């Protein structure tokens, strides 16, 4: 019962570092640290929450019946099941740890710069797809109107086609059908422009799915790279001269 | 939907000078007419009906006056063009075509709905189509608020009309800080009152020595007496025949407040500037005011298109995860997928998170009932189901990486208090950039409106009927059935910051003394956190305590509106405190935050949205920023429906301000289009060429119509008159922002500013800079009210859209590098000496030192991006200006892992030489010792107001900034302000940080 060399005692580490350690952990996971204010704060994982249970000393409760911290923790070890050990588990010296840190920090910035790039493409592509969907909904409405114009021309011209055929005015009949040709050919241009956009959107939708796939692939590899980098840094901080 | 760009047509930013238009006549004929891009509909319609006679079936065509044009807009809407004075290029057409129709329906309403839809950048018609009953109920029920506000505006006309348009720009307290009162000679203000005298409009000035506490009427009185006079002087008739205005802007003194309480006057005293006012007649202002009339919309004439208690349901909670349509994962990179779920009250789980079994990527099917460690009657009113599809890969040791792919949140009870039942289909959202947590409980509730996304099928329990949450009478029922060293402990907890650790012991302690708590009402946030929300027993009891709970200061109430307090009772109490104690000054000061917490609300209809909308509709200064904060977020699909509906009701009841807002919106759209051309088609073009294009475009009648004669979105009291085109420029930087210059058209502009200068930015997100500058203004305000004149000069910054914003251009400012470029270390001091020769030198060194102290403290606390000679600017008069703040808090901790607090603003020798007035060994001087004291005082003033800052930041967690995503991100402010320490230890910490950064020089007096 050393109480300093103990695995669950982390000493000078903040509440936020504790929250990172107890993230998604099972009920009964715990660790002890120096208070944020000597005094000691025990943090216990219960009901997806991290409970802070303060440790008092004068010689936790109204009468402090425990001699040392280990005796209090072990008595309860709603039960103190899984302790967060200070055993992460490579290089013995400082020249080797630094050379590895530099290797990982280099990898971390390249992956991070690549992720950022991917994210700009993700955002650009999402926006473009939204732009195309609005434009297709606008072509849809445009075609309806142009088709309604055919219906109107038909509705009207039928009575005039008879009235001009009985009058033998072949020149005027040709005028009306030249207009109908102009109208129907325009609807063809609008329909094919909608068609070209629908295939442009189909391709871009696929390109979005591929960017999304690539980002879900690098996100955990980037997180782990940062975790190892931060670990080598902490090791180098610890295995070096420390003071104010 | 909202338009893809600000272009004149789809995929064409600017129409050519002449353009061919397809004109679909009502007789079925199609005519191709060539039109000028700036031609109006009046012109085009006349030219069309002339050409139409040269076409078949023209005998069927009625008079050109019986028709209107309709077409498809970039918003995919078919719009009827009743306003034929509009120009072709301004129509926002999808394709260049126009259809001739006969105007039908309610003309008046169609016109208003188009005006509303234009202001919001979304067609009003889209809301009518929405199936959700919550939406249709919101649209109908909000009209109560609209009616009410409009009625209060005609209660005492025209005075109540003028009080809405021109609200008094006053401080929250009539009381003057001693450093402000000391600038007064026997408590008297020397004011200059101006008159515009008819018929030649001549300006006559009258200098008055009046008391600071003089109500505006009394100020008018002394000006009468100083003109006529007592020997024939007893005119009390002037009380209601004259009003005061500020020379150079639209700020009026319409209310009985001591003159010193008016911000313009309070600022004049502090700066020692003479207040230049303008006396004018009440009638000449009241006659400018139109009668604002609210019309009930057509949807208010229409209606929207067995029951058990929750407490009588004797079962546990369980949710059936059926399947997900798909996920976007590389099958070789990831092993399995699963659905992580949780039951939350705010951001805290009510029971442990429950996962489904792991399945293949290709097979997202579970058909699994997940069991929750919660009894159904114990489920609180604000309980939510937070879920996400996660991927898992275990390739390195026993270690496995867990990444979210898509998330979604849903309210377990609805706006009518009905518990969810049956099969439910939820479209999930993309994971926010920077979020690493597997759940997103801070995120919005409801299905993603994008249906081309992963859709998760769900199923809840059916209890043979409609389960409804218990009534307040039933809840009050369940609550009727369950000394000195403790009093000192209770006060100690109430003083602690909102993010301070609360131990389980302290929670059991606070809950035990829950009835004594009323003596210290400010402990309510600490007590609400001690409650076990997953226990119907404690909640029912909490509801009865809050019911009678004494009101708290708004600065404390604002906390109960953040994402940690989701309960409708708690939130209701908070809204009542604001209704009671929140002044229009403070509402204006924290509007960014109050608009942000609307996104944390479970439902569309709530007490917060009504209170805010009421205040927006009874104060046009509040209305202006309310509109601009909501409109800027309209591109964001997580809030576009909520913000669009709220903007519809605002625009329906704001009256004549809609016309002014529509002019601002159109001026802004012309600027977005212009800059969009420079960023795309003209990106690879020289400055000279770009400027040539800019001047040629701005010169166009449609551009000059739109960019001149409107109100400034930065300050609606500021009028933007004619554009001084010879002073407008595209900046040399890669972003290519615009420096725009407008004449101030006010009759007395020379007494304020002759020109209004604004930087228009399209491409960079300005929300973070807008927040940073807002935090500085708040800090500046705390300092002044504590007696410190650290002149910050927080210039205007406003985000107006998706990476679109405005920054107020500070006059005669130069970056430290500009000064140095045109050197040694005294170069800066020399520049300042040259610009402030003679008597005015002391004040320039004074100004530079105070602004320097203010910025040392502010940048240290906030941890903004490192300062250099290019992001620090100085004014000719000494005043320092910081620009381009970038990131804040601990942005660097994630990037380099180095755990510490930085000193963004390390004072260079160049800066020390200035503070020491040219001295050798600068840190020894009495100048540097005065500066150090200023810093210490500023730091402690903010530390004393820590709760406000922690709250303001907490109210932003769901905005979009990756350094402002969690509570563990606000932790930085807790370190820089050393909140877990004593005021003395905190001051020692600030001092050590300055010492370590500057390599000595920072001393003190232990007691002195
Ligand atoms: C408008 C403000 C204040 O008045 C003085 C000038 N000023 C500047 C001046 C500058 C310059 S510039 O013009 O060369 C370059 C933009 C082209 C570097 C000197 N940048 C900013 C800036 C940039 C990015 C984000 C920002 N958040 C706040 C200000 C700001 N602001």
- Say if strands B188-197 and B276-280 run parallel, antiparallel, or are unpaired: parallel
Half-sphere exposure of A175 (CA within 13 A, CB side): 16
Give the span between the Cα atoms of B853 and B832, in whole angstroms. 18
For residue B12, the 8-state DSSP code is B
Nearest to B412 by CA among B386, B384, B439: B384
Give the span between the Cα atoms of B962 and B974, in whole angstroms. 18
Give the span between the Cα atoms of A60 and A54, in whole angstroms. 6
Q: Which residues contact B210 (CB under 8 A, 6 or more apart)?
A: B188, B189, B191, B218, B219, B222, B259
Give the span between the Cα atoms of A86 and A95, in whole angstroms. 23
Resolution in A: 2.5
Structure tokens that stand for B480 in this block: 């009727």
User: Domains in chain A, please, with CATH?
Assistant: 7-89 (no CATH), 90-244 (1.10.287.1490)
- Ligand 1: which of B732, B759, B875 to mutate, most ligand atoms within 8 Å of CB? B759
Type and span of the H or E element at B644: helix B640-653
As for chain B, the residues directly before each break of C–N over 2.5 Å are 229, 305, 482, 822
In order, the DSSP letters of B859-898 are: HHHHT-S---TTTEEEETTS-EEE------SSHHHHHH--
- Say if strands B365-375 and B384-396 run parallel, antiparallel, or are unpaired: unpaired
Give the span between the Cα atoms of B257 and B187, in whole angstroms. 16
Pick the CATH number of B472-660 from 1.10.10.10, 3.30.200.20, 1.20.58.220, 1.25.40.70: 1.25.40.70
Give the span between the Cα atoms of A8 and B625, in whole angstroms. 52
Q: How far is B954 from chain A (nearest CA, A)?
A: 16
Whether the ω angle into residue A143 lies within 30 degrees of 0, i.e. cis, is: no
**Chain position carrying tokens 């980002």:** A215
In chain B, which residues have their Cβ closer than 8 Å to the Cβ of A156?
27-28, 57, 60
Q: Is B154 exposed, middle or buried (0-12, 13-18, 19+ CB in 10 A)?
A: middle
**Ligand 1 centroid to B455 CA: how many Å?**
44
**Can you state the angle between helices B687-698 and B657-679, rounded to 10 degrees?**
150
- The sign one gets for the Cα dihedral A166, A168, A172, A174 is positive
Subunit contact A217:B333, Cβ cutoff 8 A: yes
Give the span between the Cα atoms of B993 and B728, in whole angstroms. 43
Q: Which of B10, B405, B897 is closest, CB to CB, to A216? A: B405
Q: Tell me the three state secondary structure of residue B35.
A: strand
The answer to whether B368 and B386 are in contact (CB under 8 A) is no
Q: Tell me the three state secondary structure of residue B437.
A: coil
For residue B316, the 8-state DSSP code is E
In order, the DSSP letters of B127-153 are: HHH---HHHHHHHHHTHHHHHHHHHHH
In order, the DSSP letters of A38-86 are: --EEEEEEETTEEEEEEE------SS---SSHHHHHHHH-----EE--S
**Can you state the angle between helices B607-616 and B568-581, rounded to 10 degrees?**
20
Q: Which residues contact B507 (CB under 8 A, 6 or more apart)?
A: B529, B530
| 3-class SS shares of chain B: helix, strand, coil, % to 5 | 40, 20, 40
* Nearest-10 Cα torsion for B245, B177, B577, B506: 160
Q: Starting from the edge strand earliest in sequence, which strands make up the sheet with B455-459, in order?
A: B365-375, B316-324, B455-459, B423-427
Structure tokens that stand for B463 in this block: 């209890």
- Point out the ligand 1 atom lying closest to the alpha carbon of residue B759: 1
- The sign one gets for the Cα dihedral B177, B182, B186, B187 is negative
Give the span between the Cα atoms of B180 and B191, in whole angstroms. 16
**Ligand 1 centroid to B871 CA: how many Å?**
8
**Cα B265 to the center of its chain, rounded Å:** 27
List of E strands, B174-253? 188-197, 202-211, 243-246, 252-253
HEC letters along B361-424: CCCCEEEEEEEEEEEHHHCCCCCEEEEEEEEEEEEECCEEEEEEEEEEEEECECCCCEECCCEE
Q: Starting from the edge strand earliest in sequence, which strands make up the sheet with B97-101, in order?
A: B30-36, B18-24, B97-101, B68-72, B78-81
Q: Ligand 1: residues within 6 Å at CB?
A: B 731, 733, 737, 759, 769, 795, 807, 809-810, 813, 815, 870, 873, 883-884
For residue B89, the 8-state DSSP code is G
The answer to whether B121 and B92 are in contact (CB under 8 A) is no
Q: Which residues contact B155 (CB under 8 A, 6 or more apart)?
A: none
**Can you state the angle between helices B485-495 and B504-512, rounded to 10 degrees?**
120
In order, the DSSP letters of B746-815 are: STTGGGT-SEEEEEEEESS--HHHHHHHHHHHHHHHHHHHTT---------EEEEETTEEEEEPPTTEEE
Q: Tell me the three state secondary structure of residue A151.
A: helix
List of E strands, A128-243? none
Give the span between the Cα atoms of B454 and B325, in whole angstroms. 6
Q: Which of A220, A226, A234, A240 to mutate to test the interface with B (most CBs of B within 10 A)?
A: A220
* CATH numeric code, B307-468: 2.60.40.150
Count of C-beta atoms within a 10 Å radius of residue A166 = 8
Whether the ω angle into residue B158 lies within 30 degrees of 0, i.e. cis, is: yes
Q: Which of A16, A37, A175 is closest, CB to CB, to B56? A: A175
Q: Which residues contact A99 (CB under 8 A, 6 or more apart)?
A: none
How far the first Cα of chain B sits from its last, in Å, is: 68
**Cα B620 to the center of its chain, rounded Å:** 15
**Ligand 1 centroid to B756 CA: how many Å?**
16
- Ligand 1: which of B883, B885, B886 to mutate, most ligand atoms within 8 Å of CB? B883
Q: How far is B140 from chain A (nearest CA, A)?
A: 28
Count of C-beta atoms within a 10 Å radius of residue B104 = 9
């Amino acid at each position: 019962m050393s109480l300093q060399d103990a695995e669950w005692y982390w000493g000078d580490i903040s509440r936020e570092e504790v929250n990172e350690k107890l993230r998604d952990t099972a009920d009964g996971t715990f660790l002890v640290r120096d208070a944020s204010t000597g005094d000691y704060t025990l943090t216990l994982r219960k009901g997806g929450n991290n409970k802070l249970i303060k440790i008092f000393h004068r010689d936790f409760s109204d009468p402090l019946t425990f001699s040392s911290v280990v005796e209090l923790i072990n008595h309860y070890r709603v039960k103190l099941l899984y302790p967060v050990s200070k055993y992460q588990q490579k290089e013995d010296n400082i020249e080797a740890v630094g050379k590895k840190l530099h290797e990982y920090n280099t990898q971390f910035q390249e992956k991070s710069r690549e992720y950022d790039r991917l994210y700009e493409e993700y955002t650009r592509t999402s926006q473009e797809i939204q732009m195309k969907r609005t434009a297709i909904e606008a072509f849809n409405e445009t075609i309806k109107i142009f088709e309604e114009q055919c219906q109107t021309q038909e509705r009207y011209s039928k009575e005039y086609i008879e009235k001009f055929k009985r009058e033998g005015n072949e020149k005027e009949i040709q005028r009306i059908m030249h207009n109908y040709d102009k109208l129907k050919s325009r609807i063809s241009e609008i329909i094919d422009s909608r068609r070209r956009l629908e295939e442009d959107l189909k391709k871009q939708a696929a390109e979005y799915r591929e960017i999304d796939k690539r980002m879900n692939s690098i996100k955990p590899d980037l997180i782990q790279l940062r975790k190892t980098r931060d670990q080598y840094l902490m090791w180098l901080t610890q295995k070096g001269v420390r003071q104010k | 939907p909202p338009r893809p760009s600000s272009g004149e047509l789809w995929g064409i930013h600017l129409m050519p000078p002449r353009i061919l238009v397809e004109c679909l006549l009502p007789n079925g004929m199609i005519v191709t007419l060539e039109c000028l891009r700036e031609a109006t509909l009046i012109t085009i319609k006349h030219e069309l009906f002339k050409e139409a006679r040269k076409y078949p079936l023209h005998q069927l065509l009625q008079d050109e006056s019986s028709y209107i044009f309709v077409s498809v807009t970039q918003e995919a809407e078919r719009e009827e063009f009743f306003d034929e004075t509009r120009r072709l290029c301004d129509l926002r057409l999808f394709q260049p075509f126009l259809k001739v129709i006969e105007p039908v329906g309610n003309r008046e309403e169609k016109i208003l709905n188009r005006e509303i839809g234009f202001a919001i950048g979304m067609p009003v018609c889209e809301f009518d189509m929405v199936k959700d009953p919550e939406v249709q109920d919101f649209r109908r029920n909000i009209l109560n608020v609209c009616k009410e506000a409009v009625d209060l505006r005609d209660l005492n006309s025209p005075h109540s009309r003028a009080m809405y348009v021109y609200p008094p720009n006053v401080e929250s307290s009539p009381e003057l800080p001693k450093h402000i009162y000391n600038k007064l000679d026997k408590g008297q203000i020397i004011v200059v009152i101006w008159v515009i005298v008819s018929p030649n409009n001549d300006k006559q000035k009258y200098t008055l020595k009046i008391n600071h506490d003089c109500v505006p009427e009394q100020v008018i009185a002394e000006a009468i007496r100083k003109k006529t006079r007592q020997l024939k002087l007893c005119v009390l008739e002037y009380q209601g025949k004259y009003i005061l205005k500020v020379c150079g802007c639209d700020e009026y003194f319409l209310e009985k407040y001591p003159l010193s309480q008016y911000k313009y006057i309070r600022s004049c005293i502090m700066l020692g500037r003479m207040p230049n006012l303008m006396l004018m007649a009440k009638e000449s202002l009241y006659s400018q005011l139109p009668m604002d009339c609210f019309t009930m919309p057509s949807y208010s004439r229409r209606i929207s298109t067995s029951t058990k208690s929750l407490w009588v349901i004797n079962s546990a909670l369980r949710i059936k995860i059926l399947c997900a349509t798909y996920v976007n994962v590389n099958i070789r990179d990831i092993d399995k997928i699963y659905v992580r779920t949780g039951i939350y009250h705010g951001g805290e789980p009510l029971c442990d998170n429950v996962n489904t079994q792991r399945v293949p990527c290709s097979n997202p099917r579970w058909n699994e009932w997940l069991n929750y460690d919660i009894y159904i009657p114990d489920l609180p009113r604000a309980a939510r189901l937070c879920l996400s599809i996660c991927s898992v890969k275990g390739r390195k040791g026993a270690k496995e990486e867990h990444c979210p792919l898509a998330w979604g949140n849903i309210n377990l009870f609805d706006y009518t208090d009905t518990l969810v039942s049956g099969k439910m289909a939820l479209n999930l959202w993309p994971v926010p950039h920077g979020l690493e947590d597997l759940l997103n409980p801070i995120g919005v509730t409801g299905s993603n409106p994008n249906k081309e996304t992963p859709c998760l099928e769900l199923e809840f329990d059916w209890f043979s009927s409609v389960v409804k949450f218990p009534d307040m009478s039933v809840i009050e029922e369940h609550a009727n059935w369950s000394r000195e060293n403790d009093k000192e402990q209770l006060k100690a907890i109430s003083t602690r910051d909102p993010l301070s650790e609360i131990t389980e012991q302290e929670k059991d302690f606070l809950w035990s003394h829950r009835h004594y708590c009323v003596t210290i009402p400010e402990i309510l946030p600490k007590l609400l956190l001690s409650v076990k929300w997953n226990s119907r027993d404690e909640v029912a009891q909490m509801y009865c305590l809050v019911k009678d709970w004494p009101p708290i200061k708004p600065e404390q109430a604002m906390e109960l509106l953040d994402c940690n307090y989701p309960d409708p009772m708690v939130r209701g109490f908070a809204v009542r405190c604001l209704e009671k104690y929140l002044t229009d000054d403070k509402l204006s000061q924290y509007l960014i935050q109050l608009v942000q917490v609307l996104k944390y609300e479970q439902y569309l209809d709530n007490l917060l949205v009504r209170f805010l909308l009421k205040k927006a509709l009874t104060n046009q200064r509040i209305g202006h920023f309310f509109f601009w904060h909501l409109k800027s977020e309209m591109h964001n699909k997580t809030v576009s429906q909520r913000f669009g509906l709220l903007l519809e009701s605002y625009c329906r009841a704001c009256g004549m301000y809609l016309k002014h807002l529509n002019r601002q919106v159109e001026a802004m759209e012309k600027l977005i289009n212009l800059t969009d051309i420079l960023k795309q088609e003209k990106k690879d073009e020289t400055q000279k060429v770009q400027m040539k294009f800019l001047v040629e475009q701005m010169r166009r009648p449609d551009f000059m119509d739109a960019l001149q004669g409107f109100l400034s979105p930065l300050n609606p009291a500021h009028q933007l008159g004619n554009l001084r085109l010879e002073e407008c420029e595209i900046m040399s930087s890669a972003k290519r922002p615009l420096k725009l210059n407008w004449e101030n058209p006010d009759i007395m502009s020379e007494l304020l500013f002759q020109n209004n200068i604004i930087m228009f930015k399209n491409g960079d997100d300005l929300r973070q800079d807008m927040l940073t500058l807002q935090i500085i203004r708040i800090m500046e305000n705390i300092w002044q009210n504590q007696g410190l004149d650290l002149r910050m000069l927080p210039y205007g910054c406003l985000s107006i859209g998706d990476c679109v914003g405005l920054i107020e251009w500070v006059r005669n400012s130069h970056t430290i590098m500009q000064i140095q470029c045109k050197f040694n270390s005294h170069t800066l001091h020399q520049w300042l000496k040259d610009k402030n020769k003679g008597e005015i030198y002391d004040a320039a060194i004074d100004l530079f030192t105070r602004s320097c102290a203010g910025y040392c403290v502010a940048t240290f606390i906030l941890g903004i991006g490192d300062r250099h000679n290019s992001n620090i600017m100085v004014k000719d008069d000494g005043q320092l200006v910081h620009i381009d703040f970038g990131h804040f808090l601990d942005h660097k901790k994630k990037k380099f892992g180095y755990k510490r607090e930085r000193v963004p603003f390390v004072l260079t020798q160049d800066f020390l030489i200035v503070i020491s007035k040219g001295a050798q060994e600068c840190t020894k001087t009495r100048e540097f010792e005065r500066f150090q004291e200023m810093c210490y005082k500023a730091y402690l003033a903010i530390r004393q107001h820590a709760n406000l800052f922690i709250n303001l930041f907490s109210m932003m967690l769901g905005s979009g900034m990756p350094e402002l995503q969690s509570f563990d991100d606000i932790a930085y402010i807790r370190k820089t302000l050393a909140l877990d320490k004593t005021e003395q230890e905190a001051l020692e910490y600030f001092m050590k940080q300055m010492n370590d950064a500057h390599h000595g020089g920072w001393t003190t007096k232990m007691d002195w």
